[PDB]
Design an enzyme around this catalytic site. Structure first.
Site, PDB file in Angstrom:
ATOM      1  N   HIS A 116       0.814  -1.227   0.000  1.00  0.00           N
ATOM      2  CA  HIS A 116       0.000   0.000   0.000  1.00  0.00           C
ATOM      3  C   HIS A 116       0.861   1.297   0.000  1.00  0.00           C
ATOM      4  O   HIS A 116       0.301   2.386  -0.143  1.00  0.00           O
ATOM      5  CB  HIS A 116      -1.106   0.032   1.084  1.00  0.00           C
ATOM      6  CG  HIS A 116      -0.623   0.119   2.503  1.00  0.00           C
ATOM      7  ND1 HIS A 116       0.028   1.249   2.983  1.00  0.00           N
ATOM      8  CD2 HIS A 116      -0.785  -0.755   3.525  1.00  0.00           C
ATOM      9  CE1 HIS A 116       0.263   1.011   4.268  1.00  0.00           C
ATOM     10  NE2 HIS A 116      -0.198  -0.184   4.636  1.00  0.00           N
ATOM     11  N   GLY A 154       2.359   5.834  10.305  1.00  0.00           N
ATOM     12  CA  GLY A 154       3.768   5.714   9.949  1.00  0.00           C
ATOM     13  C   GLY A 154       4.417   4.422  10.419  1.00  0.00           C
ATOM     14  O   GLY A 154       5.567   4.136  10.055  1.00  0.00           O
ATOM     15  N   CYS A 196       3.434   1.400   9.595  1.00  0.00           N
ATOM     16  CA  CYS A 196       3.313   0.376   8.555  1.00  0.00           C
ATOM     17  C   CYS A 196       4.660  -0.109   8.106  1.00  0.00           C
ATOM     18  O   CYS A 196       5.575   0.692   7.944  1.00  0.00           O
ATOM     19  CB  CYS A 196       2.486   0.882   7.377  1.00  0.00           C
ATOM     20  SG  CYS A 196       0.730   1.046   7.750  1.00  0.00           S
TER      21      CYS A 196
HETATM   22  C1  QS3 Z   1      -2.344   3.691   5.445  1.00  0.00           C
HETATM   23  N1  QS3 Z   1      -2.827   3.193   6.732  1.00  0.00           N
HETATM   24  C2  QS3 Z   1      -2.051   3.191   7.853  1.00  0.00           C
HETATM   25  O1  QS3 Z   1      -0.905   3.592   7.930  1.00  0.00           O
HETATM   26  N2  QS3 Z   1      -2.819   2.665   8.891  1.00  0.00           N
HETATM   27  C3  QS3 Z   1      -2.383   2.563  10.267  1.00  0.00           C
HETATM   28  C4  QS3 Z   1      -1.683   1.453  10.728  1.00  0.00           C
HETATM   29  N3  QS3 Z   1      -1.375   1.232  12.013  1.00  0.00           N
HETATM   30  C5  QS3 Z   1      -1.771   2.133  12.904  1.00  0.00           C
HETATM   31  C6  QS3 Z   1      -2.496   3.308  12.585  1.00  0.00           C
HETATM   32  C7  QS3 Z   1      -2.915   4.248  13.561  1.00  0.00           C
HETATM   33  C8  QS3 Z   1      -3.606   5.366  13.194  1.00  0.00           C
HETATM   34  C9  QS3 Z   1      -3.915   5.603  11.859  1.00  0.00           C
HETATM   35  C10 QS3 Z   1      -3.535   4.720  10.889  1.00  0.00           C
HETATM   36  C11 QS3 Z   1      -2.814   3.541  11.215  1.00  0.00           C
HETATM   37  C12 QS3 Z   1      -4.098   2.292   8.449  1.00  0.00           C
HETATM   38  O2  QS3 Z   1      -4.939   1.706   9.104  1.00  0.00           O
HETATM   39  C13 QS3 Z   1      -4.207   2.730   6.960  1.00  0.00           C
HETATM   40  C14 QS3 Z   1      -5.171   3.929   6.912  1.00  0.00           C
HETATM   41  C15 QS3 Z   1      -6.601   3.469   7.098  1.00  0.00           C
HETATM   42  O3  QS3 Z   1      -7.018   2.550   6.067  1.00  0.00           O
HETATM   43  C16 QS3 Z   1      -6.111   1.586   5.692  1.00  0.00           C
HETATM   44  C17 QS3 Z   1      -6.632   0.561   4.920  1.00  0.00           C
HETATM   45  C18 QS3 Z   1      -5.798  -0.450   4.482  1.00  0.00           C
HETATM   46  C19 QS3 Z   1      -4.461  -0.420   4.823  1.00  0.00           C
HETATM   47 CL1  QS3 Z   1      -3.460  -1.798   4.445  1.00  0.00          CL
HETATM   48  C20 QS3 Z   1      -3.917   0.618   5.559  1.00  0.00           C
HETATM   49  C21 QS3 Z   1      -4.749   1.634   6.033  1.00  0.00           C
END
Ligand code: QS3
Ligand code: CL
Lengths: 302, 296
Positions: free
Chosen positions: A41, A143, A145
């Site tokens: 992603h 961040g 990820c």
């Molecule tokens: C790009 N994303 C991303 O970095 N996080 C996050 C990860 N881990 C913790 C977080 C805490 C606070 C906000 C976002 C966090 C997501 O959940 C998100 C954004 C939301 O929708 C998606 C959908 C699919 C996929 Cl694979 C990633 C995402």
């Protein structure tokens, strides 16, 4: 003596964390030999989150679109391929700090350490368990990820998790290092929810054996149970069914403490019925389920 | 989202762990520059040390034997001068911590790191660690940017299963001595400022059930807190909690009234951050660091 939620030393994994930037998105990558593994992603834009066609988005990218930073050194991307939900960036330098490693896919109930990173920089290490609903109760902000889950056997790092997303309940979803998600999750911003979570029964029993090894016996009773009767009681408290495999796995701890697994199951049934009554077990007022039978043996014995 | 007991990344400290052997005793040493620091019980310590030669201390760094070229004692730590400076020596400081402060512990056996966990120096100067025989010399530390602040060296286990150790200058935390003798940890108390910090962490993570409309005076809170074996909350603690108070909109004395209600009435089947007990091993700084994403 003592029982702590213990993570593996993170040094071998810290020397693998890099920052991956594609357009406006920046996340973490795992640099092993001449390949940087990261969530695919990272190629997604603002209008791509709901229904991304990763094959279509990736074919439009060139190697120079991926900026990879290892410390204050920019690595040159010389190739890119996708494997399930992980992007593999071939780089022009093998990581000199590459440890002996394996990619292992874990089962629910299994524990691992998480090296939480932001901008390719390790910020913390903690212990996790793959929940029965395939989510992990992590500690992740935007961040994070690309942050990875791992275990260390001898000098070998078994990478088992790569962080991809947070579900609406604050729990986390990710893949193994081959890009296969744990659970029925997809790397899309479409409506997704974690299924009802349950307690990892074999791990609670392992933790009750850890308490016995550390001198806590207050919860033991004169009763035993059949495996079937235990499962009928356990399911009522949202506990995972205990299988014959779990009973077998608990064999060594049972031999060490002199308490038969079904005897320990009867203590657990009684704890579920009575609660703790102002008492704690290993400094906890709740039944702990994020220590496996293997973790208990490693920590209490070596 | 999420709140975990999180340790600092241990890599900078792992590159410093060595095995020290003297006679039949084998324990861990911390190799910084050309000195290996380890508990002096590896050997009347002035009388026992004067009888030792450099070659009596076998120091192993991985599969490489370091040659000991000197030895001196500083309080309860032995300093073995070695012929080689550790190439992996990070930027470091020796810092002595106060009770309530937290740190990461890299548990080692035979100079090999086996685990890392987050600990707090209890108000009774013990740590509720997890250590087996051979863990002596394992170290506690914090990281500030790229600087490792070594704050603890493990020496022993008390009869209650709790642990006692020194700072890196060999000064014990607490009224403990390094010998097999009758020693006991004093009555422990809860680190109040840390419980409040953890209540703010719960608010930041969406848990508000324990909040109430009430406030309290600092004096009234301390009268209640003293009854429940809680450490007194000082004006310094209130000041330290300022940023978390500003971020959540809950004044420190407002959270103190929540804590008072939790102490007198309990959780009532509820949990806070997945815990049925009030957690006191996260400082106000740890809460800010974890709820902001500071890297090392
Ligand atoms: C790009 N994303 C991303 O970095 N996080 C996050 C990860 N881990 C913790 C977080 C805490 C606070 C906000 C976002 C966090 C997501 O959940 C998100 C954004 C939301 O929708 C998606 C959908 C699919 C996929 Cl694979 C990633 C995402
Ligand atoms: Cl597994």
């Amino acid at each position: 003596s003592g029982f702590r939620k213990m993570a593996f030393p993170s040094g071998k994994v810290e020397g693998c964390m890099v920052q991956v930037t594609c357009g406006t998105t920046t996340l973490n990558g795992l640099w092993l030999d001449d390949v940087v593994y990261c969530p695919r992603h990272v190629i997604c834009t603002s209008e791509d989150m709901l229904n991304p066609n990763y094959e279509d988005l990736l074919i439009r990218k060139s190697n120079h679109n991926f900026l990879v930073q290892a410390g204050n050194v920019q690595l040159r991307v010389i190739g890119h391929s996708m494997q399930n939900c992980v992007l593999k960036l071939k780089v022009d330098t093998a990581n000199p700090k590459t440890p002996k490693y394996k990619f292992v896919r874990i089962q629910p109930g299994q524990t691992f350490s998480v090296l939480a990173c932001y901008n390719g920089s390790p910020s913390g290490v903690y212990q996790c368990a793959m929940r029965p609903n395939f989510t992990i109760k992590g500690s992740f902000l935007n961040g994070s990820c690309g942050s990875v889950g791992f275990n260390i056997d001898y000098d070998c790092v078994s990478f088992c998790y790569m962080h991809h997303m947070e579900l609406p309940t604050g729990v986390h979803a990710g893949t193994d290092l081959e890009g296969n998600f744990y659970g029925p999750f997809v790397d899309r911003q479409t409506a997704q929810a974690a299924g009802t979570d349950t307690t990892i029964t074999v791990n609670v029993l392992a933790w009750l054996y850890a308490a016995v090894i550390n001198g806590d016996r207050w919860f033991l009773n004169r009763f035993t149970t059949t495996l079937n009767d235990f499962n009928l009681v356990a399911m009522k408290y949202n506990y995972e069914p205990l299988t014959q495999d779990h009973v077998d796995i608990l064999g060594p701890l049972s031999a060490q403490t002199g308490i038969a697994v079904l005897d320990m199951c009867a203590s657990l049934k009684e704890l579920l019925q009575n609660g703790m009554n102002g008492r704690t077990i290993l400094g906890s007022a709740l039944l702990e389920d994020e220590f496996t039978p293997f973790d208990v043996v490693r920590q209490c014995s070596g």
